[PDB]
Each structure stands twice: as structure tokens, then as C-alpha cells.
Ligand binder design. Structure first.
Ligand SMILES: [Mg+2]
Ligand SMILES: [Mg+2]
Ligand SMILES: [Mg+2]
Ligand SMILES: [Mg+2]
Ligand SMILES: [Mg+2]
Ligand SMILES: [Mg+2]
Ligand SMILES: [Mg+2]
Ligand SMILES: [Mg+2]
Ligand SMILES: [Mg+2]
Ligand SMILES: [Mg+2]
Ligand SMILES: [Mg+2]
Ligand SMILES: [Mg+2]
Ligand SMILES: [Mg+2]
Ligand code: NA
Ligand code: NA
Ligand code: NA
Lengths: 120, 210, 144, 53, 63, 144, 107, 50
RNA sequence: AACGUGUCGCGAUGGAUGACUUGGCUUCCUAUUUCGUUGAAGAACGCAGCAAAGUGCGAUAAGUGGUAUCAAUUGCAGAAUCAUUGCCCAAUCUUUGAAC
RNA sequence: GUGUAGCCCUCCCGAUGUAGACGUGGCGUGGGGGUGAGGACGAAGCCGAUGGCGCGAGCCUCGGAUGGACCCGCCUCUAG
RNA sequence: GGGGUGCCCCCACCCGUCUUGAAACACGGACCAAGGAGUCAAACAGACGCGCAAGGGAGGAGUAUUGUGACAACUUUUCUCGUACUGAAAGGGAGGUGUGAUACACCCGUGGCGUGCGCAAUUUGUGUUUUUGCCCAACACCG
RNA sequence: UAGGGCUGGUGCAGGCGUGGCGGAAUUCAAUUGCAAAGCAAACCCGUUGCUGAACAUACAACCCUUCAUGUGAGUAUUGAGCCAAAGAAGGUGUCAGCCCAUUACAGCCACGGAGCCUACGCGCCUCCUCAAGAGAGUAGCACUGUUUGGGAAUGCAGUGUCAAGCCGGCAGGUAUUUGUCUGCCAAGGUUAAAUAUAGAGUAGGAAGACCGAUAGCGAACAAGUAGCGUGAGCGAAAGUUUGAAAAGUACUUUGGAAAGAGAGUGACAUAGAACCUGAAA
């Protein structure tokens, strides 16, 4: 419920959100196969999940989520990285709305969420 | 150069304006549409809570004073003790069933008294008076399913049972009487006016005559 | 209803058909033979009107006749003319409804004839230049 | 009007608009002054002056 | 007026009238109230502060 | 609106219509109605001759409600009746009854020509109003 | 400062009456900027079955049937971000005005 | 004059009415402009400096 | 001749303008609405693995306890429902200060 | 058809000016209501032996080996 | 045709201000950017625009409404200005013609005179009628 | 007989409160400079027809030749769809109803110790209930002072004097004495609602024809801070706005270092770290 007729108020609420709010704001759509199975449009992303990037320089790349850097509003994906001058490898952040979820790390709490959001 | 202007008399030399050194003395009305909405909301809320009692209690009809408003009628504060006795209602019990009571009014003429007595009698015949105990009804009270037919009144003036104010009807066309076409009404009225105006002077003349 | 004189007084200063760029007052009214912003030329508020335009390689003459002035769908007619039509017959087709536009009708009919001829020549020349040069791409709109 | 107390539609100032039709009417045209002949357009060969020479 | 031009052009059989202007309140204030033979109404804000006794008034007539 | 003021016309004139010699200063003649008997005497005497001085008796606690007495003339009595009633009654017929207190009037003055006879109820009446209404076929009934 | 204004009651009713009559002339309607080429019989009056619609899809079909969809499309294409400081003050988008629909009540 | 009523589902005429005579009234665009200018001032909110 | 002057291309110095805005100012509304000897408001000194200011806290000292949610916090370490996050019932609460 | 890129064509008479008054379909700036457009094939801003138009306030095109995201024409309302 | 730079012959006292009089041996004046001064309210008057008109207009309140909703719509007035003035006050309070010396009778009407747009009727341009608005001088009526 | 939940004890119940959960539809099809672009002049024709003055790969600075190197991210354009009781305005590497979060009850869950509301909510025990008089250092009066529109004295204060109630006292806007009439009954106390919040708080909300970094609060920043004064007090400047992302320049060479010359990242380094644009003097 961040969006408001007040632009000044809506932007303050977004950029000063606490950690538990930022978890919901960082959500990604499910793939077509997952949608046909669980009947859920989208879910919040978490570590050890598999995603495919859809927008940006890395298009079509797949990998496993390594970190959810909520302080920078980005997620880290393995095999999505850049080289430094010294040769060191560093991860590159990608916004969660530019990806899609292909595999979910199932859990008894995560299963409860899917049954909550099941539209059927 | 001033010319032909009125002398102003504007009356504004008393530090009413808020500035860097003065708090000021002002009153604005920016909350007028908001306060109108709030008052309406409270009236609807009160009606829901006190249902099915009428919104406003019964009031009497009175005459306005002075010669400017002699012919006008309005609503008074409460009913007179003489009026309540004439309709056979005790004053302390009357306040219980929604009748305003005024212990200061005087009832100086029968015309005003008779109008207000009729107001109470009509209100009494229209009351339904839900019983205090539904299992044991005492005294003439509402019967069963007469309670279920009650309805709140929201007339803003409490005129659901009594109605509006009573004023004499306008006269109808007629013919001029033979004496009306002869009598000099200014001579009639001036003679009476002079009797009071020159009461002191005429007495002084007779006393000097002795 | 109301008259042309009253309606012109209402819209003369401001209208969506009035273009006042660079101090020049012209008109974008579709039923204006020349773009002059005047009461006589403005055919949208006139009871009867006629304008001359082109439809491919033929002269197209739309008329109002002012009998269905409350039904926008039936206000105008199309009346496609024959190929190689003389400007005198177009001049006589107009002036049966607006005799005060007969001389403007002849000049417009001649200008439309010349533009049709030029479009054929310009397109023919442009196609010849495009025949020899090679192009990196070509877009075809899908059917159905 | 019943909803608005005492309101009526205002009366027109003109019983008929289209003053152009009135100007171009037989009755109005019957009282207009007749047209007069105008001089010829000044040709080339500017007209003389100077009276004496 | 568009009916008049229709039936009576050139104004045959007409009577032209104007309407009064001398009774207006603004006209009553023209002039100075304090000069002899004036009869001009002053611009008064406080009616009770400009009463004046019957004597001490200006002369009502002048040639 | 600020765009219609003289300030917009005076941008660049340096004096705003107040002159170079006698400038725009603050109160060169005093504040308010100052000096009305010393250096503004001619203005006061010419336009407000009755300003200075006293006149008449006093009246504490006026109570304006006791002197309420609106007046109406015999010439305006038709405005208090129905339109049909004005021509319906004459001389020996049944006449309409007008009550002045309901309409907000106290005294009946007699000025002008009376139109139709009627019966008028009033608190006060005049000498002339009484005579004129009686001759026309009406009467006055005193009220309180 | 004097923010509000009073207007004579009769003058306000005169203005409404004049605006209603102006909406009855197709020449004045086109001159204001509305697209009414496919409409028939201005002023347009439709049956009362419109009040019983429940789905927005049904409403859109009705607008296309009577030819009022062109004015709706004109408003849709004109939506854009407002120029100037106004976009910082809670008015970020501007759009044009389309058709009216008048109903006997709020039902 | 007469006004026709069109159906909401197909290109058809289903009724007939009369002009309500409010559309015949004079058009005073100078009055409309004056009333609109002053009516549009009544939604304003106040502003001021401290 | 050098110095000095003028026009043009390029480069310095300086921080204007435009576009941005989690700030101000102004108006309106709603409450189970109003501190303290059961020690307030203010003032001082301390507390983190690396921690100057600011923020939170008080020797239980960037927090103990209850509750809902679940995988983070992140500059580098380091640990792996129990943390973090939001809210709140149970607690701790250094030296002073009406200070008794 | 007062006033504009003046509806058009002939003819006659005046044209300087401090303080001051008045007029102008006179110029320009920030914002509101309408209407019509423009922009990553490059918006605002900035630069100029870039010219054209207007008595003038000014407007517009051109080039940038400048910039990198918004902005304007017309009718009206408003002002720090 | 426009633009830039130089040259020749000719012309040409430093801007703003107070002042009778400034190029002044009268005052303020090194350069650039951004700021910088007739505004808001209230009482009255005149000109001009708009609505209604012997009447005009409210205000405060109330009635019906997440909707362009602090808007918009709705409510013989209940108040105010005006249709009547005059006197310190008690108080009084204005039509015309005719006939007589709260008088009597009528009611399609400018109190009379002069100068008076336009219209009407005559003579061949003049004279005449009704005169609107305005102004002048004499009545009459009200306090 | 009846009642009192506001006599007291003991229990059973709604709602006010707090914390959570739940809503549709494209990352659809065509690019990596130039066709991911247009034309068919109101509406239909058009679910259809026709293409190219940037390619005989153009542009890149006095002219010609060779050899080179150069276009960030589709929320842009075009064509097809779909949702709408939702078109709502925030985020996302460019302008987004269908990428994300939001948008609702025409709702669903757990918690709830005091309080407030509901046949004055509902049982049981206990208790409870159904001729006189009327305010004394008071009111009044005198003098003095102040206050008021209150004028031979509107309210109050000080001192002096100081009542009536057997035809009482106070008020009735010009002083005194006398007689009527009208309205009230001082000198003890409590009391909701409609009203204020003109430099206050505690939690929430709603906005704006307002200002836009010399403006708006002094303070958009570790601001009542740094600094100044013995003290009472006074009181700033300053947008970290590089970039989508630090990818924040490895390495070679000269130099004591700072740095320079090359190399490299990035669409752009004349975006290189008080780093958008970058004017005038
Ligand atoms: Mg003078
Ligand atoms: Mg101060
Ligand atoms: Mg001058
Ligand atoms: Mg002046
Ligand atoms: Mg002077
Ligand atoms: Mg001149
Ligand atoms: Mg501004
Ligand atoms: Mg001197
Ligand atoms: Mg000088
Ligand atoms: Mg000298
Ligand atoms: Mg008390
Ligand atoms: Mg500041
Ligand atoms: Mg400051
Ligand atoms: Na701008
Ligand atoms: Na000096
Ligand atoms: Na005493």
C-alpha cells in the first residue's frame, strides 16, 4: 500500500522501507510451467532459487540465486559476474522485476504461502 | 488632492494584523464545509443510537414580543405548568416521554393556552409508549407487534404528530357596510391618540380652573 | 435552430480549426477550399457547402445540401467524378448549392488536376531511382 | 420550473437570427438607394496639370 | 428590433422615446453642498454626524 | 488581476506618475482627517458644511424596534392583490380585503389616483388616504 | 486574501442553460474538439437498458455501437506527462475531455 | 421537432421524443465565460509564508 | 623592432543556468489524547570485534523478555526457529536534577 | 469590417516634446483550465562573422567536432 | 543582398540625478552572475461590462449526494438596501380637471409657458401638429 | 408483588481496539545505424493497396586516396491480443492497465488484562427501594482612585458610615420628594453539547492554481551543529546530482614522491572521484 496520491509520501515510504517490507517489494513472476502447476502469478524471491533474466545485458542467462542484497535492492546470480582490473571476479546486481522464477526451493512455510495464494 | 469624498471612518488602528511582532486578532472560515459535514454525521449517528425516539422533543408555540413581531409565531423553550395540568400530565413524568417543560412561562391569555393544550393532546394520542418490561405489561402501553411497527421521526422540528404553527386564516371578500362608508377613521383614531398624549396638559388646565 | 451569423460570432476568436502561427490566420477545416479563415470559406458552420479533393487519380466532390444538418452520419455525400473531367462541369456541379463560390471552385478543380499529374511523375521517377540501389532491409506488414 | 422556484427560460432578444437574410430580402431591397455610375479606371499616361503650359 | 426592420424600414410611422436620467441618485450629488444656492446632496458616511442646526446653513438662493 | 494594473505600464519610467520635483513621500498632509479646521478648512466647508458642531436632543437606549412603521401609498395598493382581483371588483360589488400587517406595512398614506376599491386593514392612516378610499367605494378597518 | 467568489443565482442558471443549448449544435461541438463523425442524431439519446450493465466489456460494446468510441480513443492517445513544475506537485499526467453520459440518478 | 431514440445493442430506432425546449434558449458565451471564471476560483486552497 | 590594440579556433579560471527533490510552508480531519517524590523535563559520563561524530541504549549498556513472519546482516570479519525486521505486555535503568 | 499578416481601391488633413494622462487581435516570464502537436533518427539549457522577418519590445530557421530527458503553438484564468 | 575587419573625407563634450541653469573645479559611478522596490484587506465615489427591475441580493444554517466532492445542485425570507420625505422634538405626510367658497362630481392620463431629436400632415422650399430626453422661468401639493 | 448490573460478590455474552492473510490481464511478434519507418488529406474504403533522395553503405571538418573505428538499456514505433466492481498517481537501465508492489469487502484469521457501548445486555447469592422560613460589617450612602458607549456617576477597590423584612428588597439608561404599575428574590455550591488552540504535545490520516538550493523554516547535509562573547545571548557555510552497474584505471616506462607518457573499463573518461550540465567577468 505504498502507492499514494502524494508522490512525496509514496517515495519516502519506498526508500525508507524496513527489511521485512523490502522482502515483499522484491518479487518476481513465476514461469509458465510453474504457473500452470501452482496457479500463482508471482512470489517473493529467496536464496537457492533458480531464475532466468529477461531484461538487460544478460538476456537468457540462467543461474541460482546467491544473495538477496536488500540494502541495494538487487539480487546476485551465479555465472552473472564481471572481471575487475586485477582479474578478480565480482557479482553484478540485477533488479528482481527483470527476472523470472524457474525453480522454487520448497519448504513447509513456502508451501503454506502457495496454498494461501492459490487462485483456484 | 482630495476632492468630494465621504469621510472614511474605517476603524482599523488596533494591531489586528499578524506580523513579525504581533500575534494578531483574526478569525477565518476555512473549516466551514468540513464542520458542516461533521455536524450532519453526528445527527445521523445520534438517530441510529436512540432509535426509535424522535430526534427533537416536543415544544410549544409562542408569540414574539414588541410591535415589530406581534403577528409572528415561533417555537418556545418548553410547556407551561398550567398547560400540563389542563392536559392531565405530571411535569416530572412529562420530561420522561420527550416533552420539554418550562417552569417560568406565565400563560397570560387563553388563546395561547388553548393552542398549546391541543398540541399535548394530539401528541399523547400518537404516542405508542413501549412497555418497560416486555414479559409483564402494566398500564395502557404498546401491544405486541405494535412495537415492531414504530418509526423514527426526523422532521428537524418535531412536527410529525403536532404539525405546523397555527395562524388565523385570511379573510374573504365581502361588501362595505353602510356605516363603514361614512365613519371618518382618522378622526376616530386621532381623538384616542390625543387623549393619552394630552392627558397631563388637560389635567393641569382643569386644576388651574378649579 | 441558430444561424450562421450567430455561430460565426461564437467561434471567430477561438476554434480548433483556427491556426494562428507566425501571425498568419489559416484554417484546418476539412471542408475549406483554400485555407482562409473567413465566414464564406468555412464550410463546417455553413448551411450548405462543397469541397473538392482527390481520391487516387480522380476528382472527389463532397457536398452538404443542408437538409440533414442534425445527423452527422448523413451530412455529406461522396460523388466521385469520371476520369479526365473538365473543370467547367465541376464548376457547374458547385454553384447549384453555393453560387458565391463558383470562381473559387474552378481554380480549385484546376489545381487538383495538376497535382494528380505531378504525383504520377514524381512517383514514377522515385521508383526508377529505387530500382537500382540495394537495401539492407525491407518490412512487410503481415496479412489478416 | 418546478425544481427551481420561479425560474423560466429567458426571452430572446431577436425573434429571428440570420440578419443576412433580412438584408437580402425584397422588402428591404425596395427602399435602398440606387447604384450610381463610377468613373473609368485611371489609365496609364498620367493626367496633366499646370494649367498654363 | 429585427421585426421592426422587417415591417417598417426607413422608420415610417414610428415614435422615438428615450427615458429619464435626471432623477438618478448620482446626479443629486453633483456640485458642492456648501456653496450658496447649491441644493447638492453631500456624500455622507455617518448620517448623524452631519446634521447642522437650522440656522448657520448656507444661503439657499443666488442670482 | 495584477496584469491590468498601472504598475505594469510603469515598468521603466522610474517615477510611476509621481513626478521629479514633488516626489512620493509618506503623509505630506497628515493622517486621516487631520487639520480639518486649520489647513483643510476649505475642503471641509465646501463639501461637508455640517460636520463640526452639535444639534438637537439626545435619546439614551434607543431600542429601534419600538419605532417600526413602514408606509405604503394608495397608488401601490394593486401590488398587494392578485392580478384578477384588480379588475373583478367595482363600487357595489364584493371587494378584496388587504391586510397590511401580513405584508409588512403599518401606515397607509394616500398619494396618487386609486385604481380599484378595496378594504384595507392598517394600524395608522392619513387624512387624505381616509377621504380618497371612502369616495372610491372602499373602507379602512383599524388594526393593532 | 479573497479566495472565493459570489455569483448571482439567476446568472448561474443562465450560464447552464446556454451551455446546454450549445451542446445541441453539431458545428459548435466539432469546433470545440470532439470527434462526432460516426454519431447519428445529435443530441444523442439512448435507451434505458444501459443502466443495467454490470461488466465493463458490455459498456465498451455499447460505446462502439453508437459511435462514441472515437472520442474515447482521442483521450487515450493524448495522455502524456505534464510540462513544467506541475509534475512535482501531484499532477503528473494530463489528458483531454471525452464524452458525457447523463443518468437520472446515481444507480 | 422530433428526436429519435436509438437502441444500445444495434443500429436501430426504438422510440421517439420531443425537444425539451431548453436547447432552443439563447447562447450567451459571454455569460458562460464570466460565470466559469469566478466559479473556478471556489476550489482553491490558501497559501502563505510564515 | 618590442610593448600595447582588435577579430577568430582551442585551452584555463569560476560555479551561473536547465532538468532533478526522502526538504519547507499553508489548510483540513480522526482518537480508549496530556509529565512528575512509584523521582519528571533538562544536564553529565559511559556501552559495538574493528566505532570520531550522529543514532539506539544504561554495568542485563547499538541491548534481555513476549509476539507475528522467515533467511538473512553485509565495508571486512565472524556465527549458523534462533537471528534480523515490525509491534508490545515482563524487566534492567550509572552520576545528577523539584532533589529531599 | 474599432483594433491583426490591417476585406479591397482612390482622395484630403496632421505628425517634435520634460512633469503628466490615456490607448494597443502590442512584446516577454512562472503556474491553472481547454485545445493541438513535438522528443533517444535526440527535450530543456548553453555558444555564434547563422541568416531572415518586425519602426520596436522581440520572433524564427541554421550549425555545434554542445548536452542527454523532457517540452511547446493558440484561446482564456492567475501572479512573489 | 546580409555579416566581419581596416582605411579615407565629414559629423560628434560623460552617463544617472537635484536644479532657473551640468561637459562641469556639484553628488553616485573597477568588472561579471544571481537577487532587488505601488502589494493584500476593509468603507465610499465615478467610468465601463453582465443579470434582474418597483424591486434587487443575501449571510448564517439546513436538505439530498470516493464520486472532477473544501466543488456543484436545492431551501409571499428570517436580514439588508430601495420604492417618501420632513421637524430639535411631540408629530405629520405629497395625482389631474371641472364647480363652489376630510367641500362636491368625474378618472384613456403629460399643471401651464419657452427652446427642443424624430415622426405625421400641407406648399413646392416654406409654414404647421405631437413632441421624447434636457434646460429656463410661473403655479400647485407635503413637512 | 416488582425493579435497581450505578449497593457488593460470583459467572456467561456482542461490538470499540491491536496484529496478520486474500483479487485480473503480454516481458506477445518483428531490430542493434539507415524499414523496430512511412503514405493512401473529416468518416468509410483499410482485416486492404503502395514504398526507399541515409546504401549507384551514408556521416566523421581546406580538398583527394588508402587503411581504419564508431551506435548502452525497449516503459519508443508498428501489428496483434487480453483485464476492468481494478485506468491509482509508486518502483523497475527511456514515456508501463497486463514486469513488481498496489487498487475490495458491494470479506477471513488468530489476541485482548482495565475501560466504554448493547431489552438502563444475561443468570445466582446479598442489599436497598416502591404553619413557619429562605444566606449582614452583606446591600446601600459619602469621599477618593480606576474602568466603561453608560452620559447629575456602567463595574470594581480603599477608608468612614452602615439597613429593611407591620404596608419588604432589587431592576425598569436625566437628578430630587410623593403615589401607582410591571418583572424578579442578591449576599452558599455542582453541572454535558454546540466555542478556542494566533510560535504546545502523543499517534495517525488528507491535501495544495505555494517555494524549488542566494528560494522555502536559521537548518533538503553528523543544524540550534561548527564558530563568537566574562555573561545575558548571537549563530553560519555546505545538494557526495560520477556512472544502469565501481566495472573507481591491472600492467609497461620516466620520476625520491606528487605526477607525466602508454595500456585498459565503460555507449560516453572533455563522466576520473566534491567527478550531470558547465554561462559571464
Ligand atoms: Mg494643488
Ligand atoms: Mg522580532
Ligand atoms: Mg515621460
Ligand atoms: Mg500620478
Ligand atoms: Mg506633492
Ligand atoms: Mg509624440
Ligand atoms: Mg512563482
Ligand atoms: Mg543653485
Ligand atoms: Mg548631467
Ligand atoms: Mg567649473
Ligand atoms: Mg462553576
Ligand atoms: Mg538555505
Ligand atoms: Mg540560511
Ligand atoms: Na521550463
Ligand atoms: Na547630495
Ligand atoms: Na459594606
Amino acid at each position: 500500500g505504498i502507492k499514494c496520491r502524494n508522490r512525496r509520501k509514496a517515495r519516502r515510504a519506498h526508500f525508507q522501507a524496513p527489511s521485512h517490507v523490502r522482502r515483499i517489494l522484491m518479487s518476481a513472476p513465476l514461469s509458465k510451467e510453474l504457473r500452470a502447476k501452482y496457479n500463482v502469478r508471482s512470489m517473493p524471491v529467496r536464496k537457492d532459487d533458480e531464475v532466468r533474466v529477461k531484461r538487460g545485458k544478460f538476456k537468457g542467462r540462467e543461474g541460482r540465486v546467491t544473495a538477496c542484497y536488500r540494502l541495494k535492492w538487487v539480487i546476485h546470480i551465479d555465472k552473472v559476474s564481471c572481471e575487475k582490473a586485477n582479474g578478480t571476479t565480482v557479482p553484478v546486481g540485477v533488479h528482481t522485476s527483470n527476472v523470472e522464477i524457474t525453480k522454487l526451493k520448497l519448504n513447509t512455510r513456502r508451501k503454506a504461502i502457495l496454498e494461501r495464494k492459490d487462485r483456484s | 488632492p482630495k476632492g468630494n469624498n465621504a469621510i472614511p471612518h474605517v476603524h482599523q488602528r488596533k494591531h489586528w494584523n499578524p506580523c513579525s511582532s504581533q500575534k494578531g486578532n483574526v478569525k477565518v472560515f476555512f473549516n466551514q464545509p468540513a464542520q458542516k459535514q461533521r455536524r450532519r454525521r453526528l445527527r445521523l449517528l445520534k438517530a441510529k443510537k436512540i432509535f426509535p425516539r424522535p430526534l427533537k422533543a416536543l415544544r410549544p408555540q409562542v408569540n414574539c414580543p414588541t410591535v415589530r413581531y406581534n403577528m409572528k409565531r415561533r417555537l418556545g423553550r418548553g410547556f407551561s405548568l398550567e398547560e400540563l395540568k389542563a392536559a392531565g400530565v405530571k411535569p416530572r413524568y412529562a420530561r420522561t416521554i420527550g416533552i420539554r417543560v418550562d417552569r417560568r412561562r406565565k400563560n397570560k391569555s387563553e388563546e395561547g393556552m388553548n393552542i398549546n393544550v391541543q398540541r399535548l393532546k394530539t401528541y399523547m394520542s400518537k404516542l405508542v409508549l413501549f412497555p418497560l418490561n416486555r414479559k409483564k405489561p402494566q398500564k395502557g402501553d404498546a401491544t405486541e407487534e405494535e412495537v415492531k411497527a414504530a418509526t423514527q421521526d426526523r422532521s428537524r422540528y418535531g412536527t410529525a404528530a403536532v404539525g405546523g404553527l397555527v395562524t388565523p386564516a385570511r379573510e374573504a371578500p365581502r361588501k362595505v357596510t353602510e356605516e363603514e362608508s361614512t365613519k371618518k377613521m382618522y378622526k376616530f383614531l386621532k381623538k384616542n391618540h390625543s387623549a393619552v398624549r394630552f392627558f397631563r396638559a388637560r389635567n393641569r388646565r382643569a386644576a388651574r380652573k378649579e | 435552430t441558430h444561424s450562421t451569423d450567430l455561430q460565426w460570432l461564437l467561434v471567430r476568436q477561438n476554434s480548433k480549426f483556427l491556426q494562428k502561427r507566425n501571425g498568419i490566420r489559416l484554417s484546418s477545416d476539412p471542408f475549406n477550399n483554400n485555407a482562409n479563415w473567413t465566414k464564406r470559406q468555412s464550410g463546417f458552420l455553413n448551411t450548405k457547402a462543397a469541397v473538392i479533393k482527390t481520391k487516387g487519380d480522380r476528382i472527389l466532390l463532397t457536398t452538404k445540401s443542408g437538409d440533414t444538418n442534425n445527423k452527422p452520419k448523413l451530412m455529406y455525400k461522396k460523388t466521385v467524378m469520371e476520369p479526365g473531367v473538365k473543370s467547367s462541369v465541376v464548376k457547374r456541379a458547385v454553384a447549384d448549392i453555393r453560387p458565391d463560390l463558383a470562381k473559387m471552385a474552378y481554380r480549385r478543380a484546376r489545381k487538383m488536376a495538376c497535382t494528380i499529374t505531378r504525383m504520377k511523375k514524381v512517383c514514377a521517377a522515385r521508383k526508377e531511382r529505387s530500382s537500382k540501389m540495394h537495401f539492407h532491409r525491407k518490412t512487410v506488414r503481415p496479412k489478416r | 420550473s418546478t425544481v427551481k422556484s420561479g425560474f423560466m427560460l429567458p426571452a430572446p432578444m431577436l425573434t429571428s437570427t440570420d440578419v443576412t437574410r433580412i438584408m437580402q430580402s425584397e422588402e428591404v431591397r425596395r427602399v435602398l438607394k440606387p447604384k450610381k455610375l463610377q468613373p473609368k479606371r485611371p489609365s496609364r499616361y498620367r493626367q496633366p496639370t499646370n494649367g498654363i503650359r | 428590433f429585427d421585426q421592426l426592420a422587417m415591417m417598417a424600414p426607413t422608420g415610417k410611422n414610428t415614435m422615438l422615446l428615450r427615458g429619464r436620467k435626471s432623477g438618478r441618485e448620482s446626479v443629486k450629488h453633483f456640485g458642492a453642498a456648501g456653496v450658496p444656492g447649491s441644493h447638492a446632496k453631500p456624500h455622507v458616511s455617518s448620517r448623524g454626524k452631519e446634521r447642522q442646526r437650522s440656522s448657520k446653513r448656507r444661503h439657499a438662493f443666488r442670482h | 488581476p495584477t496584469r491590468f494594473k498601472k504598475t505594469r505600464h510603469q515598468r521603466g519610467s522610474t517615477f510611476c506618475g509621481y513626478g521629479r520635483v514633488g516626489k512620493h513621500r509618506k503623509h505630506p498632509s497628515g493622517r486621516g482627517n487631520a487639520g480639518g479646521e486649520h489647513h483643510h478648512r476649505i475642503n471641509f466647508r465646501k463639501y461637508h458644511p455640517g460636520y463640526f458642531g452639535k444639534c438637537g436632543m439626545n435619546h439614551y437606549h434607543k431600542k429601534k424596534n419600538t419605532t417600526w412603521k413602514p408606509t405604503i401609498n394608495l397608488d401601490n395598493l394593486t401590488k398587494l392583490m392578485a392580478k384578477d382581483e384588480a379588475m373583478k371588483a367595482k363600487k357595489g360589488e364584493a371587494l378584496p380585503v388587504i391586510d397590511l400587517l401580513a405584508n409588512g406595512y403599518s401606515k397607509l398614506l394616500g398619494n396618487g389616483h386609486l385604481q380599484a376599491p378595496c378594504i384595507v386593514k392598517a394600524r395608522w392612516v392619513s387624512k387624505l388616504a381616509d377621504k380618497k378610499i371612502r369616495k372610491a367605494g372602499g373602507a379602512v378597518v383599524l388594526q393593532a | 486574501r479573497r479566495w472565493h467568489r459570489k455569483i448571482n443565482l439567476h446568472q448561474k442558471r443562465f450560464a447552464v442553460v446556454s451551455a446546454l443549448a450549445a451542446s445541441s449544435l453539431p458545428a459548435l461541438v466539432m469546433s470545440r474538439g470532439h470527434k462526432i463523425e460516426n454519431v447519428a442524431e445529435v443530441p444523442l439519446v439512448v435507451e434505458d437498458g444501459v443502466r443495467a450493465y454490470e461488466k465493463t466489456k458490455e459498456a465498451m460494446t455499447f460505446l462502439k455501437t453508437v459511435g462514441a468510441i472515437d472520442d474515447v480513443n482521442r483521450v487515450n492517445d493524448s495522455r502524456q506527462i505534464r510540462a513544467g513544475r506541475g509534475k512535482m506537485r501531484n499532477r503528473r499526467y494530463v489528458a483531454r475531455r471525452g464524452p458525457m453520459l447523463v443518468m437520472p440518478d446515481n444507480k | 421537432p422530433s428526436v429519435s431514440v436509438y437502441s444500445a445493442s444495434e443500429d436501430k430506432v426504438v422510440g421517439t421524443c420531443s425537444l425539451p425546449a431548453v436547447f432552443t434558449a439563447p447562447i450567451r458565451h459571454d455569460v458562460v465565460q464570466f460565470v466559469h471564471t469566478n466559479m473556478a476560483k471556489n476550489s482553491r486552497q490558501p497559501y502563505a509564508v510564515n
